[model samples]
Target chain A: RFVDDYLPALLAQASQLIASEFHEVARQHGFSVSEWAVMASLAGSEPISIGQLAQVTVTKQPTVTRLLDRMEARGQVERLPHESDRRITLVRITRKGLKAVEHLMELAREHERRVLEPFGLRRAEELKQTLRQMIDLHVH
Target chain B: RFVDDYLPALLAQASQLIASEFHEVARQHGFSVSEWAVMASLAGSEPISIGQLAQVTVTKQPTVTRLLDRMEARGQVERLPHESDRRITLVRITRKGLKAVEHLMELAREHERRVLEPFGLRRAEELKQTLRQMIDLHVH
Candidate 1:
């Protein structure tokens, strides 16, 4: 018997649920999942190159470029030519983008609160810690 | 301090890791994450509507239509008019789509195996149960 056969199924369902929530929240701000992902990546580190963003977001270069193009058109992001590496373009969030991200963050926080509400704060914290350890173990 | 504060960060990182792996594996067959997501969604369910597929895949209607268009063009999927609901279109996988999905499933299974290889089968199964319980507790 495959002892862990159900793991992938659970993960797939969990991902779908989370993605649905993300899409709902982002749509309120006229953003797509890819756009929100890019903004979140930039929030952690501003003026990052597209290549770096793609690496962090795990999206293809062409896909990231297309996402950036749409975001730029919407005034959520701006592309600045790298002073040192002309071939590289750095992406920065505009003030509008910052506001958008902030709003989405608020919605996301609320969503998190709702999801973890059943666990209570203490249990939720414990779960979060365990998940963090698992992630760190796998990622590093 | 509440460790639950790290939940979003952990999820973001984990999602990136999963998405990155998905991209890498799917790229071997020239499919993007979105495209693979659609195929996977269809594999689990047949004769699904675009709206339902969008919900399952966490993509927008337009995006789903566009993806299906490309898939259809590549002989991966076919859109049939709904018998009851004339306004609704149902998407079904073709032979090529089935083969593609099977190939992707193999890659996905192998990738999943690698991710869970660190844990014992019993522990991995327990973790899967725990995750499923957690998701149900939160989502329901």
Candidate 2:
């Protein structure tokens, strides 16, 4: 009954499993999960500093930098000097990165739908809202 | 509304945030999160094989082995010879490990309690079941 008591572990496990499902989808489209997340975080075409990238992608700076380096080499992302602070590393998605995410987002949508497929639409929304609350409380 | 969509990412975010809340306690007890997880998985005191250890912790065997090495060095766990089969590695928790876990499990309990505090008990149970379904679908 590990799941019966370890709710946090359960949530972590469930989250990892679900992400790997998307990881497969991302891999097929030539993006790793980290790559896809960075790309997605830049989806609005706005530049974010490395610190902001960490927050947006929910990744640590070290890991994000490593992944960003690889994506930069692949021409999926660009590191431009910040408009005001040359000290800041401002990251923005390249046209290729945005295009890939646009295509992969459909799979992301499908992945979420399938996860929520077992529940009624109302129940799914309720669960989503509850999880959002759980995250919001922790974030704040 | 960054969290307006992306259920898996939301799940990951919530799980990480809640777990970190307990990290301070774990650190005080001289236990890393993986160490605490190993302790919790072995809390029942039943001897399990290495493979079963990995399954219960949702960790891969190689990673578990590396962790087990450190755990063994710290004397938190033992790799006992299987009673009937020399071929198998039977793992069991040491008394020291149990004591530490009993302490940390409270925090784990409190973490879950605090996480679900916003919901009515019934609603929390409902959300748990939904996440369980999400995991089951992805894993099996």
For each candidate, the alpha-carbon lDDT, in order, equals 0.69, 0.79
Clashing pairs in 2: none
* TM-score, per-candidate, Cα-based: 0.60, 0.84
Could you give candidate 1's per-residue lDDT for residues B1-140 as a string of tens digits? 11124355555555566556667778878888887777777775568788877765657789999889888999988899998989999997777777877877877878777777776676566556655665565452
Candidate 1 local lDDT, residue B78: 89
Candidate no. 1 TM-score: 0.60
Candidate 1 regions off by >4 Å? A1-111, A119-127, A138-140, B1-4, B119-140
* Per-residue lDDT over A20-130 for candidate 2, one digit per residue giving the tens place of the 0 to 100 score: 778888899887778788877787757789987786567898999999888899898999998887889998888887776787887788878887887989888888788
TM-score of 2: 0.84
Per-model fnat list: 0.19, 0.57
Candidate 2 chain A: worst 10 consecutive residues by lDDT?
A1-10
Give model 2's DockQ, 2 decimals: 0.54
Error of 1 at A39 (Å): 10
